Amino acid sequence: ITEAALVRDILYVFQGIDNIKMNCYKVENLSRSLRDTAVRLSELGWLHNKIRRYTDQRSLDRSFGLVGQSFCAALHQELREYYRLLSVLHSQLQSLTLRRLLVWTYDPKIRLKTLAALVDHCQGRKGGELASAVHAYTKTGDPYMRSLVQHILSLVSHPVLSFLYRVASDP
Amino acid sequence: AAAAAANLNAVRETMDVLLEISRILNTGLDMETLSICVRLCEQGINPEALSSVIKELRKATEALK
Amino acid sequence: NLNAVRETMDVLLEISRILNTGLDMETLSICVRLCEQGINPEALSSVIKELRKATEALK
Amino acid sequence: AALVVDNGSGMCKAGFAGDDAPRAVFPSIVGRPRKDSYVGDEAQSKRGILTLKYPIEHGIVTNWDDMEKIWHHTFYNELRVAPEEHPVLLTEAPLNPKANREKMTQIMFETFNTPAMYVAIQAVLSLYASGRTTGIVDSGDGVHTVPIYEGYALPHAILRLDLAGRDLTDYLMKILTERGYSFTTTEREIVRDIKEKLCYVALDFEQEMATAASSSSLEKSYELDGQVITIGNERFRCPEALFQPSFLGMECGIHETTNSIMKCDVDIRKDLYANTVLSGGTTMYPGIADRMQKEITALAPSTMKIKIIAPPERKYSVWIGGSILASLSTFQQMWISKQEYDESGPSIVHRKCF
Amino acid sequence: AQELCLYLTKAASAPYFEVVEEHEYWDQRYTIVQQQIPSFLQKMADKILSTGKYLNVVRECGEIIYTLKERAYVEQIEKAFNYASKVLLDFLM
Amino acid sequence: ITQLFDDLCEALLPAANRKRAKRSLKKVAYNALFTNLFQLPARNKILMLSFDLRVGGLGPKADRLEELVEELEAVGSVLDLLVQLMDVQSLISREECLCHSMIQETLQVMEAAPGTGLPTVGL
Amino acid sequence: VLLQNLCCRILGRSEADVAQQFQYAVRVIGSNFAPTVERDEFLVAEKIKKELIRQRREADAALFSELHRKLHSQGVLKNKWSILYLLLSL
């Protein structure tokens, strides 16, 4: 199995579409130096699933509220960009290798680390209680995360400040 | 030199012939105004649009006089 | 009056946005208030283009 | 670094070209016992045991021996630099006698051995600081309306008014005393403070007097030893003297003097009217810009566009203008070098500093 | 490796210099912890605690760089504590 | 006026010596202000720019530029300062230059001499 | 800027005075910039002769034919259709 063939499948495992198959993306031959680097790279694609399932399962039911939409519709502007990176990486496959990917995808291994762990801390929260559980992620100090989550808060807290400028009501 | 003076002659001719076609057609234009309307028509401009303007500014200069 | 001078200052941002001038909101209020003093605007066109020039030599 | 030294009738301002403000400001005084010579704040602090001299009392240097001491003080005490190591830009009053310009030049090169120097008119520097080269400008401590066109002051149209901050301070002492208090002693320093902090120029004198006479709405308190005193119509009556010198027994106000414009060529008068710039500590009174606007408008043709420019930093606009000028690329060729001085002598200043 | 360990501490200190522990009648609100003292600010361990403390009894009512043999930050703290009191003391008179 | 030039010099200063550059940039403000001082209506200059708008399309925007200067009448020297200073095919041609300006900005570093684009190796 | 000189030639004024008309001239010229009909100097010529003949001025209809050739002889005019289409209208 050539190294180029692995670079062909990995660019798909970054999305969910599976040599590399589906919780770790167990790869199934080739030398040990190749399987190890694929394993870590393939697993980044698995994260992308956990963040995609939420923005697809909750984009189905109509009883998630008005805040749960501006959150589920702010996890997409932070995904189109992840679809622009996959665009660029594919145009060069026609040269890049495994050891060259690690530096390319070292940063989106973190943004896909906060978002894939921001949708688990707020699972059953709807309404304002969700805008209060994506604010408990700002007390972090890490200048790269505190400047990412402090942007999703600026979108999730827009519907809340829409009622206010216009608290449980009773029908 | 010379080719820069031969062009200033071939333009004073044409600007003198267009002034003849202008008087036998009895357009109210004169030698000064007519040199503006020629320059405009060189760059490419609708004479159906440019003539509506002149037919208007001349129609408003009377309400002020 | 401060409500009027806010609107007149807010409209003036757009005509500086579609004219593709690099002036952001802060540098605009600086230049508007400075032009409001009475300085000739033909000179201000040169200081901004030079401050932006020496700023680029750093980067 | 080049030095910028603003020689004031009451306060000298000194610093380095390129800076936004002077590094030092001190009284233009030299004192000797009634350490042999005292200059600046120290002379003032120990005035009790000294006889004070004011070598540039009205803007023009009258005693060069003490002026030299003020400059020595400026370099070695205030700025802590050696003049022989830095070019020096000095300021001068409008209508400064030609002989004085040569004297200043000779002293800088021969006494202080400056590597380079230049002298500029105070009013011109203030205009530069406002971003202009044309306009009419200066009220300080001991003494001008200066029309300037394209960077050149017009000497024939310059007017001098021997009425400034010092006179206003003494007038305030007088009217506060008439009120029932008593400010008469070299108390003058206290009143100067009251003046700088609580005075203002009324838009309309009579209306303001009527308001103060029928209510306490214009009164302000000032604390001395703890005694709190009240200042009423004196707040605006004091600076009113700038507009009506008769209050001081003097026979024109600053608005009328700003006559200077009428002495200029008719073709540049509109530029002056549209660019009347205020400078100096005595132009710091709140309300002075609007009052000038109103008064000039009354004197000028109804069709004239009048604009009074009052920079927030006008108290030091002379110095700031010097800092700006000395920092200009095109100005470097304008300095008088020690070489040029050795070649042509003191009189070169007339050609180099026109 | 002295340019490096200055690049870390310049970035590992922005969170601290943007905020001494608090509690929940007023001498037990904020109290100095003795261990976590930089031992080069030990000279001013009392002016820091006293500087922010005055800012809170008014708030609820209604840049620094490290250099060696140069005290540009020790002087920078005194320039703020000398204002921290002049806003509260005047607030009570 | 001596301060309004000091606040102007702060805005154009890009955020990060920031204490001496402001002192030197205030020179460039003064060194350039007095060059013009040493050496025509207002609304007409907008129309001459309104014309050039309509020619290259975008008519309604030009009908807006004139809509505001008509209400700004009921200040003239301020607008005199401002005048001094296929819908789908363009989409697919933008998201293609990005992938040309994203694989280039990083392949110019991935393949070079060891230690060129790296800043820590430059120490 | 050239449209504003025209408004100062026809109406005798300065550009600071006449600005309502120049507001009406940008409305018409703009959005009507591109030429709407195919351009040919032949058809426009056979309509300036047909017009001077209709006024019993048959002598100037054969003089124009000699002035329209000189325009081609010198060759400093790029669009000869436009300037004739306009001179005929006025």
Curated annotation (Swiss-Prot), chain C:
Presence of the UniProt keyword NADP in the record: no
Main location: cytoplasm
Any one of the GO CC terms: gamma-tubulin ring complex
Keyword flag Magnesium: no
Transmembrane region(s): none
UniProt keyword annotations, A-Z: Acetylation, Cytoplasm, Cytoskeleton
Protein name (database record): Mitotic-spindle organizing protein 1
Upper lineage: Eukaryota, Metazoa, Chordata, Craniata, Vertebrata
Coverage span on the entire protein: 17 to 75 of 82
From Swiss-Prot, chain D:
Subcellular location as annotated: Cytoplasm, Cytoskeleton; Nucleus
A Pfam entry, by short name: Actin
Annotated effect of mutating residue 58 to A: Abolished methylation by SETD3
UniProt keyword Transcription present: no
Coiled coil: none
Annotated GO MF terms: ATP binding; ATP hydrolysis activity; identical protein binding; kinesin binding; nitric-oxide synthase binding; nitric-oxide synthase regulator activity; protein kinase binding; structural constituent of cytoskeleton
Post-translational changes noted in the entry: ISGylated. MICAL1 and MICAL2 produce the (R)-S-oxide form. The (R)-S-oxide form is reverted by MSRB1 and MSRB2, which promote actin repolymerization.
Effect of residue 131 to A: In CSMH; somatic variant
One annotated Gene Ontology cellular component of this protein: chromatin
EC number: 3.6.4.-
Keyword Secreted: no
Cross-link (Microbial infection) Isoglutamyl lysine isopeptide (Glu-Lys) (interchain with K-50): where in chain: 251
Outcome following mutation: residue 67 to A: Decreased interaction with SETD3
Subunit structure: Polymerization of globular actin (G-actin) leads to a structural filament (F-actin) in the form of a two-stranded helix. Each actin can bind to 4 others. Identified in a IGF2BP1-dependent mRNP granule complex containing untranslated mRNAs. Component of the BAF complex, which includes at least actin (ACTB), ARID1A, ARID1B/BAF250, SMARCA2, SMARCA4/BRG1, ACTL6A/BAF53, ACTL6B/BAF53B, SMARCE1/BAF57 SMARCC1/BAF155, SMARCC2/BAF170, SMARCB1/SNF5/INI1, and one or more of SMARCD1/BAF60A, SMARCD2/BAF60B, or SMARCD3/BAF60C. In muscle cells, the BAF complex also contains DPF3.
PANTHER family on file: ACTIN
Protein name: Actin, cytoplasmic 1
The organism's taxonomic lineage, starting at the top: Eukaryota, Metazoa, Chordata, Craniata, Vertebrata
Curated annotation (Swiss-Prot), chain E:
Disease: Cortical dysplasia, complex, with other brain malformations 15: An autosomal recessive disorder characterized by global developmental delay, variably impaired intellectual development, speech delay, facial dysmorphism, microcephaly, and varying degrees of cortical malformations including pachygyria, thin corpus callosum and subcortical band heterotopia. Most patients have generalized seizures.
Free-text function comment from the UniProt entry: Component of the gamma-tubulin ring complex (gTuRC) which mediates microtubule nucleation. The gTuRC regulates the minus-end nucleation of alpha-beta tubulin heterodimers that grow into microtubule protafilaments, a critical step in centrosome duplication and spindle formation. Plays a role in neuronal migration.
Organism: Homo sapiens
Tissues and organs where the protein is expressed, per its UniProt entry: Ubiquitously expressed.
Portion of the parent chain present: 372 to 504 of 902
UniProt-annotated location(s): Cytoplasm, Cytoskeleton, Microtubule organizing center, Centrosome
Name under which the protein is recorded: Gamma-tubulin complex component 2
Lineage: Eukaryota, Metazoa, Chordata, Craniata, Vertebrata
Position of the signal peptide: none
Family membership: Belongs to the TUBGCP family.
UniProtKB/Swiss-Prot annotation, chain G:
Expression tissues: Ubiquitously expressed.
Subcellular location: Cytoplasm, Cytoskeleton, Microtubule organizing center, Centrosome
Lineage top rank: taxon: Eukaryota
Entry's family note: Belongs to the TUBGCP family.
Task performed by this protein: Component of the gamma-tubulin ring complex (gTuRC) which mediates microtubule nucleation. The gTuRC regulates the minus-end nucleation of alpha-beta tubulin heterodimers that grow into microtubule protafilaments, a critical step in centrosome duplication and spindle formation.
Oligomer status and interactors: Component of the gamma-tubulin ring complex (gTuRC) consisting of TUBGCP2, TUBGCP3, TUBGCP4, TUBGCP5 and TUBGCP6 and gamma-tubulin TUBG1 or TUBG2. TUBGCP2, TUBGCP3, TUBGCP4, TUBGCP5 and TUBGCP6 assemble in a 5:5:2:1:1 stoichiometry; each is associated with a gamma-tubulin, thereby arranging 14 gamma-tubulins in a helical manner. Gamma-tubulin at the first position is blocked by TUBGCP3 at the last position, allowing 13 protafilaments to grow into a microtubule.
Protein name: Gamma-tubulin complex component 3
Residues of the full protein shown: 11 to 100 of 907
